Ligand binder design. Structure first.
Ligand SMILES: Cc1nc(C)c(C(=O)Nc2nc(CN3C[C@H](C)C[C@H](C)C3)cs2)o1
Length: 116
């Protein structure tokens, strides 16, 4: 909501972001894709995203509603599916992250709705 207390909501986002990052068992989503090793990445991906950047956005108060937070998580997944071939560790890991992050987000959204 417009008038909900922001600090409980941001603590919820911090807890949720930690739970999502814990699903990065391949350790490929928690820092920006290294452009020095993937120099054509921005030719394909318009909005890179990763869990460190999400933490920066959170602490800069760029997430004022739950949907924008979830949209950036979804970008981590969709960027990875888009850039990488299906028969890669990266692609398979993005599918796993989509599956595991979904339950985290469903529970977190229920908590966010109770704050409005
Ligand atoms: C989700 C995704 N899509 C793509 C195309 C990639 C990708 O190329 N990841 C890569 N990681 C590395 C190595 N990694 C090691 C860490 C310890 C630090 C961190 C900055 C770099 C090289 S390339 O990841």
């Amino acid at each position: 909501s417009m008038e909900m207390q922001l600090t409980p909501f941001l603590i919820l986002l911090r807890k949720t972001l930690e739970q999502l990052q814990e699903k990065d068992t391949g350790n490929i989503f928690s820092e920006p894709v290294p452009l020095s090793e993937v120099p054509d990445y921005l030719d394909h991906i318009k909005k890179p995203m990763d869990f460190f950047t999400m933490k920066q956005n959170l602490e800069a108060y760029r997430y004022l509603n739950f949907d924008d937070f979830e949209e950036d998580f979804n970008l981590i997944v969709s960027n990875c599916l888009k850039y990488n071939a299906k028969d890669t560790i990266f692609y398979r890991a993005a599918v796993r992250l989509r599956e595991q992050g979904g339950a985290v987000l469903r529970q977190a959204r229920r908590q966010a709705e109770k704050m409005g």
